[PDB]
Symmetry: C3
Subunit: 270 residues, 3 copies
Amino acid sequence: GEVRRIKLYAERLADGQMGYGLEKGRATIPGPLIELNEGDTLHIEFENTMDVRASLHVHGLDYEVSSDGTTLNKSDVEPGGTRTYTWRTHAPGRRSDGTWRAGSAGYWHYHDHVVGTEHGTGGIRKGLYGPVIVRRKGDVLPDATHTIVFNDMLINNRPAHSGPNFEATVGDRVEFVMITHGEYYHTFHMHGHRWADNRTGMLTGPDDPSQVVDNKIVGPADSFGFQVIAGEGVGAGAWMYHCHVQSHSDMGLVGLFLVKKTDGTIPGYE
Amino acid sequence: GEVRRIKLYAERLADGQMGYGLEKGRATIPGPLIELNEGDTLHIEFENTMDVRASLHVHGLDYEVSSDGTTLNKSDVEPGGTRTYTWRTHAPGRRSDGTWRAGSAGYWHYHDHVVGTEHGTGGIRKGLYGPVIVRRKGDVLPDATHTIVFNDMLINNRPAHSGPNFEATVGDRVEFVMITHGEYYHTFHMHGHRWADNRTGMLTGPDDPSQVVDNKIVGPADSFGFQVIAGEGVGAGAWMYHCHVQSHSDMGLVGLFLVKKTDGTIPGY
Amino acid sequence: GEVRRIKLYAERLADGQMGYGLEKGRATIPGPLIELNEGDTLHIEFENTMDVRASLHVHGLDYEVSSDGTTLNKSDVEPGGTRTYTWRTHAPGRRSDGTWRAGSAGYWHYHDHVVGTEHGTGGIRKGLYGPVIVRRKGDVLPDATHTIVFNDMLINNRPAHSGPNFEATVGDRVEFVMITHGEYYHTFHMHGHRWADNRTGMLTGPDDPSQVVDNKIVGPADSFGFQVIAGEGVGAGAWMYHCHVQSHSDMGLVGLFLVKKTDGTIPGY
Ligand SMILES: [Cu+2]
Ligand SMILES: [Cu+2]
Ligand SMILES: [Cu+2]
Ligand SMILES: [Cu+2]
Ligand SMILES: [Cu+2]
Ligand SMILES: [Cu+2]
Ligand SMILES: [Cu+2]
Ligand SMILES: [Cu+2]
Ligand SMILES: [Cu+2]
Ligand SMILES: [O]
Ligand SMILES: [O]
C-alpha cells in the first residue's frame, strides 16, 4: 500500500527522437524503469514539453479511463501541458465467488498513444516507451536490471549495430526486461543463458512444467522478463544476444552481454 | 457425457461471403458457437447448400478420419449434399502406464478445409469459421461469451476494417474467444484488462506460475480464450481492444469493450 | 552423467546443400539427432571438410565461449580444420540463494553460425542444422523420434515444398522435434492429435494448467517437442500435419503422419 509520486517529461531529443525522462533535459530511450510492489499506487505528474500532443499508456496495471492515455478517453496532453496519471496495482487473492484474482505482478511497459496516429505509431517509433516492473511479495531481487526493446528494426532506437552492451560479473543476478514494438515479429535469443517461459522467468521449483528456452517469438507490444545468474555453468565471456530472424541479425540487431570474471577480466573477443 | 445432435448449413452470403448457420437463411460470420462438456459427443448433420464442395474441420476435438473434413480422407461434401460429422471429447485421466492423458477442454474452432484450395483458403477468407468451447467439470461459467476472429486484415470479416463492439456491465464475468486465420501474425491487446496465459485464461490459484498478460502474439489457426470480470479494479468505460501491430491498429483493427455502470451509463462516451 | 564422444563432419552435398554427418560421406539434413541425459558431457570432434569456415552452435546446453561457434569468440573452424566442441548439461537443483536452477532438459538444436554470414544465414539455408534432445531422469522414452524443421519455405530442405511422411502404429508413443529457421514465422498444426505447451509436451498430472493445443506459432530458432500416443481416441489413418499459414500450406508445406491399425492397414488406403 505504498503511495508514490514521480515527475515524468516527454521531450524531443537533440537527434530527432523523442523520449521520456524523470527531469528536464534528461530524457532517455528507453525511458526510466518504474518499479512497484503489488498494492502500490503511483501518481505520475506528466509534463509534455513538446510541440505536439503526447500521452502515457501503460500495460498490465490498473488505471481508470481518465489515465488511459488515449484520445478516445480524453486523456492525452496538449503541447506544454501537464497531467497527472494514476496507476494502481493489486495483490492476488480469492474473490467472493471462490475464483482466484490474478495480481498485477509482471514485466510491463508504458508508451505513447497519440503521437503521429491515435495509436501512437509515431511516438513509439521515435522512442516514447519504457519498462515497468511490478513485484510480488517475496520475489527475488536482482543485482542489476537491463531493458532491451526491439522497436521495428532497431534496438533501443540505437543507430545500428543497434544493440547496446550490458556488463556484469560472473554470479551476478541480472534481470532483463524485453519489450517489442512496431510492425515486425522478432525472436529474442541469448547465448550461454536460458530462462523459464513463465511470469518471472525462473522455475518455482521441481514441479513447475514451464518450458525452459533460450529463444522466444515476440510481437508488437509483447513484454516479458527473466533473471539469470550471469555465466552460470558457462563462465565469463562476451555472450551475444540477438534477434534470430536471419535478416535482422545480419543487419546488426545484435548486442553483447559482457560477463567478467571477479578480477574484472573477460576472455578476449571480436 | 451426453450425445448431442445438431444441424449445420454452409451458405453463400451477400458479398462473395460464405457462412455457417444453425438454420437455412441464418448463416453468420463467425459461425455459431458450439459449446460442449468433456465426455460429450456431437453429431453434426451438415448440409452444403452452396454450388462448390465444402467441409467442416475441427481443431482439438477427437474425430476419426471420416470426419477430418478433407479431400484426403474423402470427408468433404458435394454441392447440395449432406454428411454427418462426429466430434468426441474426453476428460483427462491417468493411462494404465501411469502417464496423464490430457483432456479435450479448451478454446477451439472449426473451419472449412476444401473451398478455394485443399486447405480451405478461400472458405476461410470468405467466412467459413466458428468457435468451439469444451468445458471441464467445475470450470467457471461466464455471463456472456464473445468471439473475435482476426481473419487476414478483417475482424469477423467486417468491412471498413472496424471491429465489433461488445457490451457488459461492471462486474459481469465475460468470456472472449480469440481465433486467428489467414496469412498474417497479429497481436491481441485489451485496455484495462489482463488474463493468464494458460488453458482457461484464469489462474488456478496461488501455485499457478503462468504469465499474466494483456497482449498476445497469434498466428493463423491459433485460438485461445479467457474470462475477465468487466471493469474489475479499473471501472466502467469504453475499453479498446485492438491488434497492436502498428499498421493494423492504424488501419482500424480496433473495437470497444463497453463496460457500463449498473445504472446503464459510461464515462464521457 | 557419462562423458560421451562423437565425431561430426560438415560436408557439401549435392545441389548447393551442406550437411552434418557422423561419418564422412554420410551427411544428412537434418543432421544427426544427438540425445543426452541431464548431467552428461559431450565432446564433439568436429571436422570441417568444406572450402568455407564452418562452426557448430548449440541452443540450451552449457558451453564455454570456446565452444560458442562464433567469429566473435574465434571458435569456428577453418576449411579442412578440426576442433573439439564440448557441450555440458546439468540437472536442476536448489541454489544457495534459495532459487531453483533449471536443468538442461528439453528440445534443442544446433546449427552453423559462420557460413555465408556471421550468423550462419547461408549455412542454415543450405542444411547445416540438427536436433538435440536432453532428457531428465525418469522422462518417458518414445518408441520413435521424428524431426521436422521448417527452414524458410522448405521442410527439412526437401524439394517441391513437401514434407516427409512418418509411420506409426496405433498406440505407439511417438516423439516429434519441431525446429524453425530462416526468415518467416510459421504455425505448426497436426490433425488428430494435440499436446501440452510445456517442456515435454505432456501434462504431468491434473495440477498442470498448461494450454493443450494443436497449433503453435513458431519463429526462427524456436524449438519444441512433444510426444503423442498415435491415433489415441481417433484411430488409424493418414493424419496431416502442416503449417497453417494459408499460403504456406497451399504451396505444399505439408506431410502425413501415417498411423496404421495393429493389423498393418490404413483406413482409406
Ligand atoms: Cu491501445
Ligand atoms: Cu528481429
Ligand atoms: Cu501498448
Ligand atoms: Cu489441415
Ligand atoms: Cu494485426
Ligand atoms: Cu485449422
Ligand atoms: Cu547467435
Ligand atoms: Cu509456414
Ligand atoms: Cu541459433
Ligand atoms: O495501446
Ligand atoms: O487444417
